[PDB]
Amino acid sequence: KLSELFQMLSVGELSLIRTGNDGQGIRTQDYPKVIAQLNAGLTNLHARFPLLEKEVIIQQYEQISKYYLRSEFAQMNTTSTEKYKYLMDSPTERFLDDVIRVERVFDECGCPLYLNNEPCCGSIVTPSFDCIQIVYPIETNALFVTYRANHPKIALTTTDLNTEVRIPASHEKALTYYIASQLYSNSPNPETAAKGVEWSQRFEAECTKIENLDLDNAHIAQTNVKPEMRGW
């Protein structure tokens, strides 16, 4: 939970600094400063490691060819006045703007489609960082975009400490070292800047350790299918 992370930061890592309040808990006024750094740390960990991969269904409309990955066009977000909401969200999968990289794209039946392929004029291109361009949209089709997902963003004004930070206990130290590095690096004092650099190096060492141990089952080899494809 966020309370545990705040206590851990207050005593042990952010101890000899103002934000830690001498190990008596993070002040209720410095929340929008640890939370901003925490969002960056969670984004870094969720982009460098595959801690959350999710899929989103994009319903194709006859007059729309550029589909934006924004919650304003979501089926569950009822606050938006968009006439056509092509994102197909469910109470289970909500699509809270947590998109880090669009990896794979499928169709309604389940056949993979090419992504960003120029020679094949049947591929789904990506114009901008959050858009999906379908040159050939059909009113009776739906996409099945799968992406690497981010942690649901914790608002800067969040006050409830029961908001759960969903990271494995192995990356707790990596996140904490990242937060310490980011908070220690703001000041231009050489002595404090050196500590910030040391925290950055230690965070990059923890990440290297987790990569070397593959605690998230990311770098796992697959069955070779090249002989079958080449006709052996």
Binding site: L16, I17, R18, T19, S187, N189, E191, T192, K195
Partner: protein
Amino acid sequence: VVIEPITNEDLTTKVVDGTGIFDELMTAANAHLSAQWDMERITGTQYAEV
């Protein structure tokens, strides 16, 4: 006027927040140090070093 004797308890009360003159001067210097430190301008180590 009534003059009072100068005793040991008028310089140091042997407490950090003492009522002596040295204790009050320490509290006053610590007030400026805390004012600067509340703006993330100095680390705890530098706070104690100064």
